Design an enzyme around this catalytic site. Structure first.
Site: not given
Ligand SMILES: [Mn+3]
Ligand SMILES: [Mn+3]
Ligand SMILES: [Mn+3]
Length: 169
Positions: A52, A88, A101, A114
């Protein structure tokens, strides 16, 4: 053996994780664990956090360390109003809102599932944000690998192998 391996990855994480105040909370959450389930969860969490931070830096975004919802992000810029989404990463520049994201998946099936989820999640926000004159730029940083700039690749490998071993339990 199993115990020596866990101690060893804890030592490797301790020594070689990039000194970064932004990882210290999660580093500790990993180091204090004893139970295999907790070692997975928190070790996987630690790796996700590294990604992230990298992904935000790569994409010129603020890391959402305070877990702000989109609605809150806007309220903080005095913008008044949504589906619950905690990105994120983010950047608000006037009326242009970048949302980031990122994720990691090993199997293409999981990666696609996902990817679809994150894509639809952000697309659903776009129509609602229009009503408050916010343009959405949705960014999805989907990765197949856990390698990152916060930890040497060789440490990373030992960590994931040890974590895979914990799936035994
Ligand atoms: Mn995440
Ligand atoms: Mn995420
Ligand atoms: Mn701002």
């Amino acid at each position: 053996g199993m115990e020596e391996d866990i101690a060893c990855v804890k030592d490797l994480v301790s020594k070689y994780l990039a000194d970064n105040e932004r990882l210290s909370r999660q580093k500790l959450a990993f180091l204090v664990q004893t139970e295999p389930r907790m070692l997975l969860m928190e070790g996987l969490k630690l790796l996700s956090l590294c990604i992230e931070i990298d992904s935000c830096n790569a994409n010129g975004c603020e890391h959402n360390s305070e877990d702000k919802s989109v609605e809150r992000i806007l309220h903080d810029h005095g913008i008044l109003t949504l589906c619950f989404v905690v990105p994120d990463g983010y950047k608000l520049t006037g009326n242009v809102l970048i949302l980031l994201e990122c994720f990691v998946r090993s199997s293409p099936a999981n990666f696609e599932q996902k990817y679809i989820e994150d894509f639809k999640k952000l697309e659903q926000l776009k129509e609602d944000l229009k009503t408050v004159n916010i343009s959405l730029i949705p960014l999805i940083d989907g990765r197949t690998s856990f390698y990152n700039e916060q930890i040497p690749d060789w440490v990373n490998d030992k960590l994931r192998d040890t974590l895979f071993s914990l799936l035994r339990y």
